[PDB]
Design a protein around this ligand. Structure first.
Ligand code: CL
Ligand code: CL
Ligand code: CL
Ligand code: CL
Ligand code: CL
Ligand code: MG
Ligand code: MG
Ligand code: MG
Lengths: 145, 144, 144, 144, 144, 144, 144
RNA sequence: UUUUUUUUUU
RNA sequence: AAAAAAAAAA
RNA sequence: UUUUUUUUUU
RNA sequence: AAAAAAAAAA
RNA sequence: UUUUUUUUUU
RNA sequence: AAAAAAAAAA
RNA sequence: UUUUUUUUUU
RNA sequence: AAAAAAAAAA
RNA sequence: AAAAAAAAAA
RNA sequence: UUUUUUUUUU
RNA sequence: AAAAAAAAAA
RNA sequence: UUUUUUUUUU
RNA sequence: AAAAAAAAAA
RNA sequence: UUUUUUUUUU
């Protein structure tokens, strides 16, 4: 700093305030996945004391990134796929990443365009995950509000 | 700009942190008695009402205070703040007064970098004095 | 400039629209109860009082509110707004307070582009809370 | 850009008008008889079909006219407009004719600033003449 | 340039996507009845005739329409488009009219970024009105 | 930018095409045996799995291949590509090998402009050889 | 910057002074009677409440006064200051008045350098008059 | 960014 | 102000 | 290449 | 307009 | 280093 | 002063 | 690209 | 950063 | 932004 | 001559 | 002298 | 003259 | 010399 | 934007 002591603040009128502000975050959590089966990721996973977010009931997802979290079947390279879901209409895209070393995580993500950045609630789902690994690690960039 | 979803060519798993810090300005009110100093508890800053009930510590940067109820008859509002610190309390009484009886009095103080350590629930931030029965505080702090 | 009517060399019949959109700033009041939130209905925006009874949808852009009646004795006015959305309600409580007991408290919020969709009469714009029994709203919107 | 709601630091209650003015180009049709002049009523401009039924006055700025049905056999379409004014009618007959028997005739006139006052429902805008049994009008006007 | 096959020094397996999105202008015709509005189904956009039967959603960006058959005797063609939205229908009636009885009438409208969300087969895009029995549509959209 | 629908002043009906071409990178896997070349069928590129079942021809531009499973014990992965053409098969064997037993081998070839003609389902793109039982291909092609 | 204690290569013993001077702005209140002048004693400035009780002399530089209680019914606040000096009292009456009944009246005077000598407890600074029962003074001075 | 060895121009 | 040792940064 | 700690030279 | 905290991009 | 959110300073 | 919606002009 | 009306930002 | 194949402009 | 008092540095 | 603390002027 | 198709560099 | 959505280079 | 109305020209 | 007729201003 520069000053070593407390100093006076010449405050004025009472300002605009908000005890319950929004928060831009990158939320990491894991999901279980079955062979050949798509898992619908619930938005509700994003509201939790583990993320300091149990006071929010809505969130605007901006991007989803996914990594395989456990090793793949014998002889195989990891893969993970993401299909975006939207209350106005689900996508059929299957964004996919594959490992090129059997010992390394597969990764992929997608970005949601501005015109599709609306709120989701716990009962909603973000996307479908497919993998040859039994767990997938997600990092979701979103705006809690 | 984009109208549909686009692929992100992600790389390796990044460094992550589910429980990050948060820079905040927290507004709450305290009751104040005539001629008596109210010690503002830090525990008042951890609350679901602030989305902060997951924190147990906080680094306070500055405190601002405004009178919240009308003053006694014939008087102009005033408010004073005395900084408190675990390593030693101050004796400064930063004070503001209203120049119109219908208007809030206000004052604040900034904590220097060398004195910005953490406080926990059982600690007190500062003492508030006023001729008004309530004071509104806006505390700028770093939750961690 | 010309003082008489003058010929217009018109061409082909142009594109027309008898019922166009309309960007508006709509002022209306709501009643508020002590300690209770009031859900502001979007239907209040369609009315011959605003020249908008022909519309059935509206895209809200921003919401501003002021206290409309005096506050309780010894108090300063306050007003809070909580945005509501059909895709998910928010939990922000944007708040303004008066610093003079004789003056209105005010505050507003802007809706981001990505949240500007249509609402109809049965939908609600936001929740209002105040220590005053009436609040005056000015809503910037696009009737379509 | 912003993806979330944001606070507006509103101030004093602003100047407001629930019933503003509106500049428009209104499209409507009139029936016209052979060799007879039809007086276009200003009242055709106040209608829920144009979202204007809350207005009772209007300042007309210009008038454009198009034939709306096919002309008699062997003929090219024509349309004439004579401006009418409450302070004294004009004797101009602005006219356009088609050069292709299958194409609309069209003509228009602009009102000068010094003659742009209000008209009410009982007033008339202009006289229309044509060899076609309907004429389509687009009137640029200021509803107030 | 090259006349033979040449080696490509490939690296690691890339990010892939077997079922990507597609920006398209889809031409199809609807049948229209005199004096009755026809609701255009989004389902008409998903067909093997457009290479699009693998999609179940689409983001519509703009809609253009042309009359597809001759108008009634005496008349010039016209077409009207009223936008429909799941969050709230509009009341605009964008209209174009022919100025030669032998020529198509045309008109269209653009959807703003804030109203560009997905629609499925059970949804409707817009209403169509016309004095012609068929209307040709060209819809700009993003299949996803 | 605009927040509401706007009129488009459409003109004459445009050139249209409901079934346009499509430049693609198609990922699919083929099974490979030890010491044997596998002829890659062009028909694998036409599939609802790729949104391409409406196509019956395709112009291949380049072929890239990766081993898709682990190699035999003690060995590093390798994959070879021999281009095939209806006017005459090549005898090149473009080859990649892994330098880490745990990593994919990769290689590809580019087709020159003079050899970029259409292929149909019964045609074959190339021969694939490898010491791994599966090979992942990404073929750059133009569906038409 | 450094994070650890560092050595100071001290030199000879410096000049020291355990009881230095202090430039201050001292705030205190005095009681005032109707139509009677109150002599502000200099002794009020040497108080443990100001950290100044070790001083027995002070050099006054400027005096400012605000009314501290509300005025009589129907009146606006006023306050007057008459400077007093040991070598000769002044007859000036610097005066301020409120222009809002709810607001303080304020005024001050500056002492010129030629009249900036020391004063002790038994000396008086100035005479205060006001229609309010209390006046709040802020005195800029140099304790020595 | 260009040298040597199989084929086309300056 | 430069250099050497430990550390941090780029 | 800058800064911090120890050292040194100036 | 700059800086700090979270995020995104480069 | 630019933007978005929270904060702060101006 | 720029921008968005309606209009008018170019 | 300028202006008029409604809105917004400054 | 120059370049293509399909869409909203100039 | 300068100056006066206490302090620190040069 | 720069900064920190109190003050003052702007 | 600009240019390709295969190899030793930047 | 170039922005968004399917594929190749920098 | 500019502007408004009618006309002609570009 | 020039010129011609009527008008006006200068
Ligand atoms: Cl009052
Ligand atoms: Cl209330
Ligand atoms: Cl014909
Ligand atoms: Cl398909
Ligand atoms: Cl006196
Ligand atoms: Mg007061
Ligand atoms: Mg009020
Ligand atoms: Mg007074």
């Amino acid at each position: 700093d520069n000053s070593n002591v407390v100093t006076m603040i010449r405050a004025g009128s009472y300002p605009k305030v908000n005890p319950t502000p929004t928060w831009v975050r990158a939320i990491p959590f894991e999901v279980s996945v079955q062979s050949g089966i798509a898992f619908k990721v619930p938005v509700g996973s994003l509201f939790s004391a583990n993320f300091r977010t149990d006071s929010f009931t809505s969130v605007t997802v901006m991007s989803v990134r996914a990594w395989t979290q456990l090793t793949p079947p014998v002889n195989e390279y990891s893969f993970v796929r993401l299909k975006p879901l939207f209350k106005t209409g689900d996508s059929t895209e299957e964004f996919e990443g594959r490992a090129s070393n059997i010992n390394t995580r597969a990764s992929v993500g997608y970005r949601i365009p501005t015109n599709l950045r609306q709120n989701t609630v716990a009962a909603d789902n973000v996307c479908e995950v497919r993998s040859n690994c039994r767990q997938v690690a997600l990092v979701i960039s979103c705006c809690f509000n």
